[PDB]
């Protein structure tokens, strides 16, 4: 089918794809600090950054299964 | 649940103020006008009717935009992106089977790529702080419905119509809390079809009296009386069908004695 | 995989946080519904009987949730305590605590679904908290949420197995009654292999659901009159080590009528809960 009659309708003409992409990207990678420093954890690549918090490695045993439950 | 109903209503009343947009937030926006928000919400309704989406999603979706546009700026071009991402985030909370992203991209006539609808829902979920559960004008009429006689048809459908007509116009419905808009909607359809005024059961439970809804009633009647001449006619067509008792064709009442 | 969890204690006299990682494919539907729903419904809830979602962070392809740390789930604790059995004061404590959390959730418009004993978390202080809220779905009234049959089989209400159109607040009460009746004897009451045998295991104890006890069963879908005429088992044998007070509460909370099952806010004033104090378990 030639696309749905009522729903398929462009609203505000053309847009700038490149500017839109960089605007989204900036803010996407801007989300840092005040949490990366509050939890003093390098959340970008799962790295236990040094600080007051004592990040430790935990085996799957001796721990509730709620913390490593795969999504279903 | 008649055991927990009082507590649920009190919690809803308390939460209705946190999940609220700031009044007059948009005139500050330097690219968009109310004639654009009305168009966006119209398109939202048209999409919702052509995907068999639940009526709770729409009321939720237009809420998120109201809590987004008043917190982070947006240009004219990517407003449809905000609307599409709002529908995507609302349907993944209230619908049993959320539609796929490719379908939403197909809806907007392939102007936004699949990677473009995302990275916006990425943005929306953090400006709202992941507080998606927002009380709205559907969740309040539901509580008020079970006190307008045990059996009364064509009341729980015109009231929904008057609740949905609220979202189209920001001015002046962006001031009243959802609990007052719902109360005005419930006491307009009831007077339209049955005759009885604001029930005594819900004037000692919600605390509102029929005097403290007069602004809401006078705001809602004008929209009721002009809906056939509005520039965005999709909700009227949506409720023209027999699923909702065809109340969209009922004659609006002329005058009130409130 | 290897570092599947990064449990981080605090040095500045703080609580213990744990990291739950969710990997985002970012190819279809964006973030999954099972994450959005849990994140949204676990921030409005703040009770001393619920896990606290301390923090949420969302990166370009990963989503971290910082939870409070609770030592031992109920399943492993009761597996290790099967030899001696759960002491009566301890189960009294673990009932007076979970009922509070369930009542709080129900009064907060949020509905829990799967009260598996693996979804209940205890710690060394004697506290207990509801853990998994992924299947939770806000209702407002029980006539808003539909049916999808996701909850675990051994803890389905007799109304859910037969097929309904809307949930209620009695599903959680039924599951809670099953757990209560199940920790006294340390045996899952109704371990059916499928829905049909689960139904046939339910009827064996509570008697065939005649219209006298259940007004709305005859017209219920997926109900048939070609059902065995099993008797109602005497409760003195279903759970032997219960006191005189506890006879009634297990029977009211295991009732058939979804509008009769005793509400959680009403279960705390039942004469069973008269002298409850919290001891400490076997090192959690």
Residue of A nearest to C62 (CA): A44
Contact criterion met (CB < 8 Å) for C73 and A60? no
Sign of the torsion formed by the C-alpha atoms of A12, A15, A21 and A23: negative
Tell me if residue C2 falls in helix, strand or coil: coil
- Residues whose CB falls within 8 Å of the CB of residue B35, separated by 6 or more in sequence, listed in order: B231
Residue of C nearest to A24 (CA): C60
Using CA atoms, how far residue C270 sits from B11, B114, B230, C96, C213, in Å, is 26, 56, 58, 11, 22
Contact criterion met (CB < 8 Å) for C169 and B4? yes
Quote the tokens at residue B157: 């459908």
Quote the tokens at residue B182: 């719902």
Contact criterion met (CB < 8 Å) for B46 and A4? no
Rg (CA), chain C: 20
Q: Is C46 annotated as a binding residue?
A: no
Interface of chain A toward chain B, CB-CB under 8 angstroms: 3-4, 6-17, 20-21, 24-25, 27-28, 31
Locate the DSSP E strands across C102-175.
110-111, 120-122, 128-130, 137-138
In this structure, how many other beta carbons lie within 10 angstroms of the beta carbon of residue B19? 18
Contact criterion met (CB < 8 Å) for C30 and B4? no
| Number of residues written out for chain B | 258
Q: Residue A16: what are its φ and ψ, rounded to 5°?
A: -100, 110
Q: Give which of C1, C2, C7, C24 to mutate to test A binding, by max A Cβ within 10 Å.
A: C7
Long-range contacts (CB closer than 8 Å, 24 or more residues apart) made by B16-23: B16/B135, B16/B177, B16/B178, B16/B179, B17/B177, B18/B131, B19/B63, B19/B67, B19/B131, B19/B133, B19/B134, B19/B135, B20/B177, B21/B66, B21/B67, B21/B69, B21/B70, B21/B174, B22/B70, B23/B174, B23/B175
Q: Say yes or no: domain C72-267 is CATH 3.30.230.70.
A: no
Using CA atoms, how far residue C114 sits from C38, C134, C152, C251, in Å, is 13, 9, 6, 21
- Angstrom resolution of this structure: 3.5
Name every chain A residue with its beta carbon within 8 A of the beta carbon of C19. 41, 67
Secondary structure (H, E, C), chain B: CCCCHHHHHHHHHHHCCCCCCCCCCCCCCCCCCHHHHHHHHHHHHHHHHCCCCCHHHHHHHHHHHHHHCCCCCCCCCCHHHHHHHHHHHHHHHHCCCCCCHHHHHHHCCCCCCHHHHCCCHHHHHHHCCCCCCCCCHHHHHHHHHCCCCCCCCCCCCHHHHHHHHHHHCCCCCCCCCHHHHHHHHHHHHHHHHCCCCCCCCCCCCCCCCCCCCHHHHHHHHHHHHHHHHCCCCCHHHHHHCHHHCCHHHCCCCCCCCC
Helix or strand holding residue C57 (H, E): strand C53-58
Candidate from C6, C35, C131 with C-beta closest to A66: C131
Tell me how close the Cα of C67 comes to any Cα of chain A, in angstroms.
9
Give the C-alpha separation, B185 to C274, whole Å.
47
- Roughly what angle, to the nearest 10 degrees, separates helices B214-226 and B178-193? 60
Specify burial of residue B95 (Cβ count, 10 A radius: 0-12, 13-18, 19+).
middle
Give the C-alpha separation, A29 to B126, whole Å.
13
Residue A61 DSSP one-character state: S
Quote the tokens at residue C3: 């570092």
Q: What is the DSSP string of C18-56?
A: EEEEEE---SSSSS-HHHHHHHHHTTS---TTB--EEEE
Name every chain C residue with its beta carbon within 8 A of the beta carbon of B131. 40, 43
Distance of CA B73 to the CA centre of its chain: 23
Residue A71 DSSP one-character state: P
In this structure, how many other beta carbons lie within 10 angstroms of the beta carbon of residue C206? 19
Q: What is the DSSP string of C190-233?
A: ---SSHHHHHHHHHHHH----TTT-TTSTT-TT--S------B-
- Residues whose CB falls within 8 Å of the CB of residue C13, separated by 6 or more in sequence, listed in order: none
Give the C-alpha separation, B205 to B12, whole Å.
13
A29 touches chain C (CB under 8 A): yes
- Residues whose CB falls within 8 Å of the CB of residue C227, separated by 6 or more in sequence, listed in order: C203, C208
Contact criterion met (CB < 8 Å) for A9 and B43? yes
- Residues whose CB falls within 8 Å of the CB of residue C1, separated by 6 or more in sequence, listed in order: none
Using CA atoms, how far residue B34 sits from B29, B40, B167, B185, C252, in Å, is 11, 10, 11, 22, 57
The span from the first CA to the last CA of chain C, in angstroms, equals 26
Contact criterion met (CB < 8 Å) for B7 and C107? yes
Tell me how close the Cα of C7 comes to any Cα of chain A, in angstroms.
6
Exactly one of C25, C55, C79, C114 is catalytic; name it.
C114
Tell me how close the Cα of A30 comes to any Cα of chain B, in angstroms.
11
Tell me how close the Cα of B71 comes to any Cα of chain C, in angstroms.
19
The C-alpha torsion from C90 through C91 and C93 to C95, rounded to 10°, is 170
Strands C62-68 and C120-122: unpaired
C257 is catalytic: no
Q: Vertex B132, ends A22 and B108: CA angle to 5°?
A: 50
Long-range contacts (CB closer than 8 Å, 24 or more residues apart) made by B17-22: B17/B177, B18/B131, B19/B63, B19/B67, B19/B131, B19/B133, B19/B134, B19/B135, B20/B177, B21/B66, B21/B67, B21/B69, B21/B70, B21/B174, B22/B70
List the C128-130 sheet strands across, edge first: C72-73, C120-122, C128-130
Give the C-alpha separation, C109 to C102, whole Å.
11
B11 touches chain C (CB under 8 A): yes
Contact criterion met (CB < 8 Å) for A64 and C70? yes
Q: Is C5 annotated as a binding residue?
A: yes
Owner of token pair 């069963």: C217
Name every chain A residue with its beta carbon within 8 A of the beta carbon of C118. 64-66
Give the C-alpha separation, B131 to B134, whole Å.
7
Owner of token pair 């005793």: C262
B40 touches chain A (CB under 8 A): yes
Q: Residue C106: what are its φ and ψ, rounded to 5°?
A: -65, -40
Experimentally, how was this structure solved?
A: cryo-EM
Q: Is C76 annotated as a binding residue?
A: no
Residue C68 DSSP one-character state: E
Contacting partners of chain C (3+ CB pairs under 8 A): A, B
Helix or strand holding residue C73 (H, E): strand C72-73
Quote the tokens at residue A52: 């007051």
Q: Parse chain A into domains and list their residue ranges.
A: 17-72
CATH number of A17-72: 4.10.365.10, 3.20.20.80, 3.30.930.10, 3.40.50.10860? 4.10.365.10
Residue B158 gets the label, from left (phi > 0), alpha (psi -120 to 50) or beta, of alpha
Alpha helices in C81-152 (DSSP H): 88-107
Rg (CA), chain A: 22
Residue B23 gets the label, from left (phi > 0), alpha (psi -120 to 50) or beta, of beta
Using CA atoms, how far residue B19 sits from B22, B131, B216, C104, C136, in Å, is 10, 8, 20, 21, 21
Q: Residue B14: what are its φ and ψ, rounded to 5°?
A: -65, -40
Quote the tokens at residue C237: 């044998």
Q: Give which of A3, A6, A7 to mutate to test B binding, by max B Cβ within 10 Å.
A: A7
Name every chain A residue with its beta carbon within 8 A of the beta carbon of C58. 31
């Amino acid at each position: 089918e030639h696309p749905k009659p009522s729903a398929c309708r462009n609203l505000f003409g053309p847009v700038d794809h490149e500017e839109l992409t960089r605007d989204l990207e900036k803010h996407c990678r801007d989300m840092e600090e005040a949490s990366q420093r509050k939890w003093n954890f390098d959340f970008q690549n799962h790295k236990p950054l040094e600080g007051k918090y004592e990040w430790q490695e935990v085996e799957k045993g001796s721990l509730p299964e709620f913390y490593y439950r795969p999504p279903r | 649940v008649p055991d927990y109903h009082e507590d649920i209503h009190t919690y809803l009343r308390e939460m209705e103020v946190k999940c609220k947009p700031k009044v007059g937030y948009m005139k500050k926006q330097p690219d968009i006008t109310n004639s654009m928000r009305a168009i966006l919400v119209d398109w939202l309704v048209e999409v919702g009717e052509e995907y068999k989406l639940q009526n709770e999603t729409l009321h939720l979706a237009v809420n998120y935009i109201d809590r987004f546009l008043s917190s982070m700026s947006v240009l004219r071009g990517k407003l449809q992106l905000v609307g599409t991402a709002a529908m995507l985030l609302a349907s993944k909370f209230e619908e049993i089977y959320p539609p796929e992203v490719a379908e939403f991209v197909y809806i907007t006539d392939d102007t936004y790529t699949k990677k473009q609808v995302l990275r916006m829902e990425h943005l929306v979920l953090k400006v709202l702080t992941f507080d998606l559960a927002a009380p709205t004008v559907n969740q309040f009429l539901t509580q008020y419905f079970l006190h307008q006689q045990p059996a009364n048809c064509k009341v729980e459908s015109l009231a929904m119509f008057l609740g949905e007509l609220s979202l189209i116009d920001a001015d002046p419905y962006l001031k009243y809390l959802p609990s007052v808009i719902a109360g005005a909607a419930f006491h307009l359809a009831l007077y339209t079809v049955t005759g009885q005024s604001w029930p005594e059961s819900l004037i000692r439970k919600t605390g509102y009296t029929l005097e403290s809804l007069k602004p809401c009633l006078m705001d809602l009647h004008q929209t009721y009386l002009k809906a056939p001449q509005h520039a965005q006619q999709s909700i009227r067509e949506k409720y023209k069908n027999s699923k909702y008792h065809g109340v969209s064709l009922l004659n609006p009442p002329e005058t009130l004695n409130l | 995989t290897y570092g599947v969890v990064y449990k981080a204690r605090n040095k500045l006299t703080g609580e213990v946080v744990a990291l739950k990682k969710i990997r985002l494919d970012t190819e279809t539907e964006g973030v999954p519904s099972t994450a959005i729903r849990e994140i949204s419904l676990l921030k409005e809830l703040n009770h001393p009987n619920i896990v606290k979602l301390l923090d949420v962070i969302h990166t370009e392809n990963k989503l971290y949730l910082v939870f409070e740390f609770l030592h031992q789930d109920l399943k492993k604790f009761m597996d290790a305590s099967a030899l001696t059995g759960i002491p009566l004061p301890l189960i009294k404590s673990y009932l007076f605590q979970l009922l509070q959390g369930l009542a709080f959730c129900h009064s907060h418009r949020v509905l829990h679904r799967d009260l598996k004993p693996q979804n209940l978390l205890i710690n060394t202080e004697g506290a207990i908290k509801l853990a998994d809220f992924g299947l939770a779905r806000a209702f407002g009234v029980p006539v808003r949420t539909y049916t999808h049959e996701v909850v675990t089989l051994w803890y389905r209400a007799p109304e859910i197995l037969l097929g309904c159109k809307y949930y209620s607040t009695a599903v959680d009460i039924w599951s809670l009654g099953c757990i209560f009746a199940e920790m006294v004897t340390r045996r899952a009451l109704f371990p059916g292999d499928s829905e049909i045998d689960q139904l046939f295991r339910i009827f064996r104890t509570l008697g065939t659901p005649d219209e006298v006890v259940w007004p709305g069963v005859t017209s219920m879908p997926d109900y048939k009159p070609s059902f065995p005429k099993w008797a109602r088992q005497d409760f003195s044998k279903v759970v032997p080590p219960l006191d005189e007070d506890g006879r009634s509460l297990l029977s009211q909370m295991l009732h058939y009528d979804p509008n009769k099952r005793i509400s959680a806010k009403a279960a705390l004033a039942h004469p069973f809960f008269q002298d409850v104090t919290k001891p400490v378990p076997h090192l959690r």
